[PDB]
């Protein structure tokens, strides 16, 4: 009732990675010094099962969003089932695939988290959406420090087979319960009301603005500074207590190809924070308000996670087969990511000088300041880990999801190699050959979540998400008459609203 | 002795809001796309008592500013006396007011806040300063989201009715115990140390500071780089462990007519946040200090919270008739609002091209920064609402007073309404008459704030705040002679000195 | 959370009906003979609420369609509160309201049933949808069996 | 609606005839005049309704009832300018989907 638990299950397929063996992966050394990676490439798979549609159907996402205001995932439960090792002996072009029950795959559980995270940057190979399917295990693989291609020298590699692990066989299944230490509930809930309105018309504030710096007089304008009373008449001079959320302006790009320039400045006009001499583009953003209201079509440039619908290439895809989120229930309080957050007078005045004024491009946080944290689509990660250093601000990461210190350890599963016909003679060098072989099946994870319940004693009738009542060829959400899942929309997480 | 009760009763007087029937209200649409408001007005009265001057007598005011260092509201105890309700039957001229016993107002007190807060904002219709005066109840309102005038969709209305109720006759009373649940005690104290002077003279630090780039050499200046030890003769580039304060940069205004620009920058040149397409200005500030040291005539264009004089039309009003605040206790660790809050490289030097530097009008929050919040008046409101979001930064809010996750709730008083001589027939229409008529009397609210004991163990006789020997016709705070009570100058909270 | 309870409050009037006397009622005999009706009109007033939007709000009525299969009425609690009977006395064309403390008001249940029921007809003066309304209680009447007015 | 043998009886109410005046001579007639005066104020009715709770375990994302986005002069349910309260459209009962 108060708390809601998700069980998934899923069949899965680990083939063997990189030979059995470690290899470092570089840039092709063709790349701009922006984009070079040092990092290394490693036997073992892992599970990513962080997305939010792993664990729930669109019907219980659905349940999950307009009937309560915040949920946050208390315990996770974890084990695989029916492992069973496959091992493929290729002659001529039969595949000839063979089951043996001796050999055995080995699971690693990080526990303490020794290795590289490497989750909560929304990479494929998670659990499909759809249960039906089976996943390919996704290659592990971490990266380091570069200098360039070269790899300075703090660079580690954590060659992962070192750390104590227990082997499965065929007929082995293990299961370990992880609970999330804690969190905020997220926030299910769109804002009533803006902060810039908090405030009843009918009772004008007892405070003034300077309402005329000038007046007439002999037709020339007198000096003379005058103040009044903020109230109804006029809103915008009226004092109030907060500020809008940090803002770190992006570039708006339209949806209709004729208003948008035509040149590249995708990567020059668009916002990056530059570090360590390489710059970064800024893809997810600090959580910024989509669009101005009345345009849903301009949206900025980076700052919406956009999410593809399938069968989409990965190198170049036209606007039609990408799906664009939507941050516009954020309005109220953060600025819009392409709008200024304010301006700001450069100058001071003097009987020579006029006033002058300054837009402020990116504001950074001041006290008395609140801001509501980016939506988790259906499509999005549902957790990142923090990472560990001295400082941080406000956990919460920018993809989305919660922040967490100790995150779901990411358990590394590779399938034990086996060589193949050793030479009869002895010889010094390590095995060249080996049987082919992989294993697959049953993963079956399952989350504990609380929910916070909505009470909400609004008299009108709420907005929630429901499907459309219009005849389709295809109903979204359904699979596609070839048997292919489909997912024809981002769900954002907040349709319900909570006065501010 | 610890903590100190402050008790006030005073009389009020509900008139009929609205007729008994909701209203929407909204923008004249002359207005500009910045001002806009599509919210509701509610039969519903609310008491708001949120003001200091309410509770505390300029004396007691006075005796809580200089005997001690901080206070914050522990509990409040709230209770209404001797309600009764005026028919008034009006004929000719007549207005025959008459009592009836029968006829009940109903109060309405939130407990867990479902309807919009509406208060912290500095509206009228507080309690009034001096007990012998008898106020109007004020009307409630609120607004949510809208496009111009129009209500977008998410826009709920609450409807006050609905939620339970206890009615009230005459004879009866109703009280509610609020307790605070916790706030940082207000900072009663300015610094008698500057942030940039943190340091003894005597003992010179053990750094270097770049002194001369250049030396002479055969008239030309050679290049030679050169480093000297921080100490009591250069204090500007001895280092430091902290950061002043936040800055967003306002506008100056001197209040001499002459120094003042001749033209209209009321609205442009003043500093303001745009928020979903329609900027807003900031009346209240980032607590800002107010004015440079030895100037006491500069002051920001917004920033400093103006309270009016009484007696002074809120239409336009001239400079002599409000009375402005002055932060000049916070000039220690916050930047002044109008001047910038320093200077930034902007580009590298070579031999080629000279250093170059542009100042930083607007500084967000660094790490290792500290701030003095601003100063609670005795006309300011002692809560605001932390409105409630998935995050926030130092919730105490600008305005001034205790950031509150729970603030007290504001009850809701309604008269009810009692139809006048029903037709004989019967009709489905709801009634258009009303008996007139309006209820009043004797609200009492009592808070227990926590006193923090200034001990100063400083030699030097310490600023008080005390009334001026001089004579005058009014004595301050004094009633004037056609009974009128008046206020001349704002209260600083902070006259005491304390080692930063 | 298995069980939903919705309470509402509503202020209503209750006029003097029929000069405190019954009257028969009958069609003005210019009807066809398909629409006659003999019943007779009563000086007593009775409460509507059999309406839904009486008792869910539209935002309860939402939460209430979608989130669950199906809803019955267990129980009702019945209440009304500060009764105040207002006297009329008009001279001139002064309304003059005066109240009074002594006039009593007579309620009657039916626990059960010996009169014609006389609801679920879904006729007008029920509690109104909105809670800031104030309703004039409905007339009491009821038909019997005729032919043609008799 | 729900079909009930036994219904909530409905409650009837009558404010009591006060005489007006009554002549000091005696007279069988019954009395022609009374008080004008009417009754008023504070009905208090709360049901308790059972719900049987939906667990549907379809994957398609279910209908639901829901306001529309589109911005409106005055918003559905709610109150006008004027004070009139107004509903817009009836709402069914059954948005849910059941396999029958």
């Not at 069949?11 to 990675?17: K, N, V």
């Not at 039609?320 to 229930?329: Q, R, S, Y």
């Given at each position: 009732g108060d708390r809601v638990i998700t069980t998934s299950t899923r069949?899965?397929?680990?083939?063997?990675?990189n030979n059995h063996l470690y290899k470092q992966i570089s840039s092709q050394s063709g790349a701009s010094n922006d984009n070079h990676?040092?990092?290394?490439?490693?036997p073992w798979g892992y599970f990513d099962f962080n997305r939010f549609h792993c664990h729930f159907s669109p019907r219980d996402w659905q349940r999950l969003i307009n009937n309560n205001w915040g949920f946050r995932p208390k315990r996770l439960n974890f084990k695989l089932f029916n492992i069973q090792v496959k091992e493929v002996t290729q002659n001529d072009g039969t595949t000839t695939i063979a089951n043996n029950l001796t050999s055995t795959v080995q699971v690693f559980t990080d526990s303490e988290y020794q290795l590289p995270y490497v989750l909560g940057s929304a990479h494929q190979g998670c659990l499909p959406p759809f249960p039906a399917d089976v996943f390919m295990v996704p290659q592990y693989g971490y990266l380091t420090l570069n200098n360039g291609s070269q790899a300075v020298g703090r660079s580690s590699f954590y060659c992962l087979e070192y750390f104590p692990s227990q082997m499965l066989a065929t007929g082995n299944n293990f299961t370990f319960s992880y609970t999330f230490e804690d969190v905020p509930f997220h926030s299910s809930y769109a804002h009533s009301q803006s902060l810039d309105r908090l405030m009843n018309p009918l009772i004008d504030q007892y405070l003034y603005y300077l309402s005329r710096t000038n007046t007439p007089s002999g037709t020339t304008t007198q000096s003379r500074l005058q103040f009044s009373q903020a109230g109804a008449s006029d809103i915008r001079d009226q004092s109030r207590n907060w500020l809008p959320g940090p803002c770190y302006r992006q570039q708006r790009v339209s949806k209709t190809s004729a208003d948008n320039n035509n040149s590249e400045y995708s990567w020059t006009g668009a916002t990056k924070y530059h570090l360590n001499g390489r710059d970064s583009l800024v893809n997810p953003g600090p959580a910024m308000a989509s669009h101005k209201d009345d345009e849903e079509k301009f949206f900025p440039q980076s700052g919406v996670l956009i999410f593809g619908k399938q069968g989409s290439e990965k190198t170049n895809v036209d606007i039609?087969?990408?799906?664009?989120?939507?941050?516009?229930?954020i309005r109220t309080t953060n600025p819009v990511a392409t709008e200024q957050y304010g301006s700001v007078s450069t100058?001071?005045?003097?009987?020579?000088?006029q006033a002058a004024t300054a837009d402020v491009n990116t504001q950074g946080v001041l006290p008395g300041m609140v801001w509501q944290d980016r939506d988790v689509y259906l499509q999005?990660?549902?957790?990142?880990?923090?990472?560990?250093?001295?400082?941080?601000?406000?956990?919460s990461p920018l993809m989305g999801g919660f922040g967490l210190k100790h995150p779901p350890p990411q358990i590394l599963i590779k399938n034990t190699p086996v060589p193949a016909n050793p030479s009869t003679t002895f010889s010094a060098a390590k095995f060249a050959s080996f049987i082919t072989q992989y294993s697959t099946g049953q993963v079956s994870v399952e989350i504990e979540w609380e929910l916070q319940k909505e009470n909400s004693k609004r008299w009108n009738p709420e907005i929630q998400?429901?499907?459309?009542?219009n005849k389709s060829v295809n109903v979204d959400f359904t699979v596609d008459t070839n048997g292919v899942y489909s997912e024809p929309r981002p769900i954002g997480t907040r349709y319900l609203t909570r006065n501010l």
């Open positions: 069949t899965w397929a680990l083939p063997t990675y990676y040092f990092g290394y490439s490693t039609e087969k990408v799906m664009i989120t939507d941050e516009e229930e100058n001071l005045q003097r009987g020579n000088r999005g990660p549902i957790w990142a880990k923090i990472p560990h250093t001295d400082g941080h601000f406000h956990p998400y429901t499907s459309n009542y």
